[PDB]
Every structure is written in structure tokens, then in C-alpha cells.
Amino acid sequence: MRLLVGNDWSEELAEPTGSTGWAVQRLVWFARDGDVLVLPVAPQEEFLAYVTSLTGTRRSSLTVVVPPPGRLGAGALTADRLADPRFLAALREAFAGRPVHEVFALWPDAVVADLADALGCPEALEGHDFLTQSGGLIGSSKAAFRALAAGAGVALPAGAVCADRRRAHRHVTRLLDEGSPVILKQDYGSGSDGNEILSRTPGLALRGARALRVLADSAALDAYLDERWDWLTEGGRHRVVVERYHPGSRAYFAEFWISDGGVRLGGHGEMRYRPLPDSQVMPAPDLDQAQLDDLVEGGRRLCVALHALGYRGVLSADAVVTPAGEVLFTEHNGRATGSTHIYEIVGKRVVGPGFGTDRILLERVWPEGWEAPSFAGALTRLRDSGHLYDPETRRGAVILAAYNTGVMLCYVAEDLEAALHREESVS
Amino acid sequence: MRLLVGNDWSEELAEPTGSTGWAVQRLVWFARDGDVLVLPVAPQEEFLAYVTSLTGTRRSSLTVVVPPPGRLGAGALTADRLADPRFLAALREAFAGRPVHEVFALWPDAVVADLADALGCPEALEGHDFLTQSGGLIGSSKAAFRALAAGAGVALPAGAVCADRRRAHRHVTRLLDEGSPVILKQDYGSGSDGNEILSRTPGLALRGARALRVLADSAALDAYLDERWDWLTEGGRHRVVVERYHPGSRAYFAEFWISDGGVRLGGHGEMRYRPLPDSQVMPAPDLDQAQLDDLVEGGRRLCVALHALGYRGVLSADAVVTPAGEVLFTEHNGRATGSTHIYEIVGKRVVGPGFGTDRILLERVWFAGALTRLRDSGHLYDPETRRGAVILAAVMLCYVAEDLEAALHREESVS
């Protein structure tokens, strides 16, 4: 029996008011026999039965525990929901006298530590003490990333970390006068919504940022900083990362599992900003040996640093390959990412040893313009067309997510072209 | 030579508008033959002569470069003073073609890395890359201390790190309802000035905070938090550390030198309240051997972690020994502290190997007049006897004697 926790982005960083309880249902992919899952919204049985049928996990051995709604409703495991005596009674009955062997959470937050303490199993949560002190936030800080990568000797685009406009203005100006565009980044921003590109020249693709600002001179920059500084600092709370932006780069990741015992490579892939990051392929294609070595060693070094200071959990090291072919690291992500269950479970467990050898994975966000009436409806159509993932041909679409009021698929194929073809058939 | 920078508390954390240039003149103690010293204010010659005669450094081999004044004046090495063309030219002249072998700064700040960049000697600054990304600030973060110590299995008072009022209220309520007093600490607070003690009971001794608030109950604390949170967070800029406070505790430090090659014990001491914090003793007295070992090994584990993440420089780990006898770490300090030149130079270089065996150092807070009268009376430090008062700054004294009782008699004499 393990306790799996489907928690969201840290309550300490942001109010999870938009959450609907859908994305964290990816937790089920990690479930193994006997496990107890804590989720904000009960998954549909059809989702559970499908996912468990593929992982080989006995569904009836699983228990799903859902807290009552909290101060922000049901969308996310807010702190008040996990402290609810009603929920705690439900949790203890789900345990049924069994010891908690391990606590696994999607996000390394103090609320998980709080839960382990309330349950009297802190020892089952690796890095518990670190987490009680809110150490897990380091996994989502770009400022922390910049310092750690630079200290560990991990290649980094030129730049700095700025707490004020005076310093920000100097570092932006240095980079712009070298003929480069610049990307500003919220310390704790999630995704490209937290970034802006600044350029002397118009017409750049908006890859990895919400907006492009064209700034002619020092005065235009003063004007920009005066207007956006509140936003860039989240109301004066956080610092801003300034770094050199490299147009037309491809985005890669190497993800690791950081335990008490040390650092272990989970997997690597490419995130396709095509022009939005709406698909990813694993493992990483089109790198030569030296670039793949740099991506993995770079990430590993970063993770060894994070391990040494006490971080425990999943760590995604994000990088770009520039048009000149240089691997530069751009951030880390301390959490179960969009990729984690895909290479770890779908790749290594469902597809098997052939994954990385004669099989790749291609996941796409449910295309806009695609519609499916329900989970069961999507599965039926896939099953009937013969495009549903078939455990003995090792080809086809794996349904990744629960019903979203469509779903989300992962195509397993010999190479990217083959998966891309599988997908056009799917309709 | 080596380039020695007498910089102050980071300009990124606070405006150093109150500095007068006096404290960073402790830089001179670290000066070795041929070095070049960057100071905000020129030291008196008599001070420079005096320090170098004790340290055995040849004074004429030294150069002091003082940047012109900057936006806050001459009191402190502000970023614009160190990027001044007039200052960079005067600095390259002081080198006169010599390569910079090592850069030593009093504070691990991004401006040091900028200066090393300007001069073309990034390789002479250990942790250069770390510092350009302002990683040195981690050495002044209590929020960082709390996580590092928790992760490193280093003992610390019960508590948490809080970003908002709701979690602070919870964690304060919990400690108070257990009957203990609580101390709130600004993430980047310099000294006790950034701390406040919360208690059910009035009259606690304010060791390490400079105000106490008596809070009867949950609504009283709502009121306090609603009133003080803006100050506690520096305008919602930083988080707040909530800790169990231990009254009547003694305060100790263990200081380490963190370089590429690893972690070296500098020294340890006590910060005495008699009744107030106006004196230091090194090495640490009145500790059992196991308490000293917990102090040093605690400090070491912590520094090993700081090392691994890239920090380079001086790191002082502060601890208290509770009335109950337990050693608990309370903060770290990444910088040359008020103690660093004392055990490292005055102790290990001036006094020699006997320091920590047959000599101890006592420093207390209450120029040629001090020197004259100390000389004429015979109380001035005598290399031949390894006893007497050392003038640490232009004044402040460090009494070298066999034990604390001998040091306190010497000071009484100096009255």
C-alpha cells in the first residue's frame, strides 16, 4: 500500500481557482496493486478500468479517496480539504490497518508533509523535513534554477536574476546591444504565460512566451519596465529572470527521479512548439550523441545539486538546442510533469523494453475541432477503427486522460512519421 | 596579488545609506604582501601601519584604491562606484600589469562578479558564475537556512516558513498553544532588527529580536498580523520564518571557509549577553565536548550542502544552546562576519598555534591615543608574551589571554 496524492500547483504560490480536477487524474497511471489514491474529483470507472487494464494493476485492489469540497470548491486538493476530519476518516478506512509504505505526490508541497504528519507516517515521505520548511518551492523557481545551474557548471543562456528595474534595465540593454532578443521570466511563472520576449527587431515567433515587445531604445525600455514591472514581479513579490533569447531553437527535456539514494534518469524528450507546445515526443529525436550526452549530463548535474540540498521527487530539466546546435538549459520543474507518466508508465511498463528501441511515443493535446461524447464513446470508436493501442502489435493510440468536458491521446509507433500518420487516421 | 573588496551588505537587499566606511576597514587584517584593497573610505595610515606590523605584511607593498563617491556617497561600495571608469582605471594602475591571483570579498555579491568581469579575471573569483546569478543571496536567507538545515538533518527550532498571513497564524497559534514563545524573522533581515518575539507572557529577555508582543488569543494575533505583516514581509517582498523561541539561551557560532576544494573549519565562539550582546569569545567556552561536536558537525553538514549548490566564501552557522542543553541552529550568514578576521587572522596568524590551546580571544565594543596609552601602560598586545589588547578597528579591542578570567582582568585594567 502506497499513498498517492493528486495535488496541484502549490497553494503557497497561487490560488488554484481555475482547476477542475481533470489533469491530476493522470495519478492513476502510477497506481500499483493495493494503492490508495487521493484525488480532488472522483474519476469515472471507465477511465480507471481502461488505465488499470493497460498497467496490469488490479482495479479492485485500489481505493480512491475524495475529500469534501473546500473554500475554493472541488477542483483542487487545497489545504483545508486535506485537513478535513471527514476526509481523514475516509483515508484511514481506505488504509484498513495497512502501513503506508510510501507517499508519492504530484507536487512537492508542505501540504503533503502536513498530511503525512496527521497520518503519523512522515517516514514514508522522502524529504518530509525539507518539505515542512517549504523547500519544495525551489523546484519551481527559475531564480533558483539560474543560481544552481551556474554553480553546477550547466550551460545557460547569458543573463541574470533581477530584483529591481535598475538592474533589469542594465542586463536587458547589454543583451539587446549584442544584437540578441531577450526573454523576461517570472521567478515562479508556470509555462510561457509567465514570460515575455523583448526585441529590437519585429516579427519573431512567440515561442515560449505570451507576448513580444519591440523596443527601439533605452527610453522605450524605461517605458516598458515602468508598465510591466508590477506584472513581472507579481505585484512586487518576486524577482525576474533576464536571459538571452535564441529564436528558432527546439525544446528538449531530461527528467530525473531524486530519492534518498540519489539521482536516477527517468527519460528524455522533445516538446514541440509547433508554434504552441501542443505535443511532445519521447524519446528525444534528432539529437546527435554529443547533444544527447550534454542534455542528460546537464540535467543530472543539476539534479545532484538539488539532491544535496534536500529536494526529493521528480525533476524535469528543460533545455533548448539552438540553431547552431548548442544545448542550453532554460529551467527546471520539480513535480510530476506532463511527460512523467508517459515515459515512466506508458513507455517503460505498457509498451515495454522496445520503447526507445523500436517504439516512440507521441502525445498531442486534444486538437481543437475534435469532439468525443464521453470517455466510453472515444474508446469505442478507437477500438472499432483498429487504431486503439494494441498490447501485442505495440501500435496505436493510448488514451492518456479522463474525459474533459474530449480526452488526450498518446500514439505508439516505430517512428514519428508513423505516429503522425496514425493520428490523421484518428477522427 | 590578490584583489580584496571591502563591500557591504548587498545592494540587492537594502540601500546601504547608513554606512560610514568604518566596518569594512577590517579588510586590512586579511591583507597579504602585494595585495590591492578596494575600500569606500581611505583608512588612516596609523591604522594601516599598526595592522600590518602585527600581521607581518609589508605595508609599502600594499595599494588601497578608493572609488570616487557614488549615489549614496562615500560610505559604501555601491554598484555604480565599482563600475566607475575612473575607479577601474585607478584599479588597473594599482595592478600595474600583475595578474589577479584570487578575489576576496567581504560579501558574496553580484557586484563582485561584475568587477571581476570588468577586469577580465572571472577565474580569480571562486563561485563567479554562481555570483553573477546572485546565488550569494542564499547565504543571507533564513528561509533558505530552514530548508537546508531540515534537509541536511541539522537540528533547528520547531517552525516553518510562511508566505501569507493564514499560514503564519496557524504556525504561531500552534507553538503558542504548546506554551512556548515564538520568534518571527524576516527572510533577509540583518541581525535582531528584523525579528520580533511573540508570547503569552510579558518580560521575556529579548535576545535576538528587538521587540516583544504579548498576544492573549487568536483575535489578538489576527490584529497583530494584520498590523505587522507589511513590515514582516518588507512590503510583501519576502517570506517570514516562524520559530519556537528559547529564552535565556546562550548564542554560539561555527564559521567555515567554503572553497572549490571543500569545507574548512575556520573557528567557533560565543556571543555573550552580559546582560547584552557586546562581547565575543573564541574558542567556544562552557560547552561539553559533545555539544561542541554537534556545533561543528552541524555547521559542517550545512556547509557541505551550501558547497554542493555552488556557494563559495565564508559561512557562519549560528546556534543556541537551550537552558535544557540542546544545540539548535537558528541561521546562517554567508559573509565575512564580525568574527572572521578575529579567529582567522588575529588568532591563527598574529597569536599563532597557541590560539585555541593556551590562548583565547575576547572582543568588546567599549586612534594613536588608544595605542599610546595601551603602549605606555603595557596593556597593548605583546608578540613576545602573546598577551594584551589588540586594536581591531579605528576603537575596538581584542584581549588575548590564557583564559576568559585573565582577559576580563586585562579589560578591567584598561578601564
Ligand SMILES: Nc1ncnc2c1ncn2[C@@H]1O[C@H](COP(=O)(O)O)[C@@H](O)[C@H]1O
Ligand atoms: N528560536 C530561537 N530561540 C532562541 N534564540 C534565537 C532563536 N532564533 C534566533 N535566536 C538568536 O537570536 C540572535 C539573532 O540576533 P543577531 O545575531 O543579532 O541577528 C542569534 O543569536 C540567534 O541565535
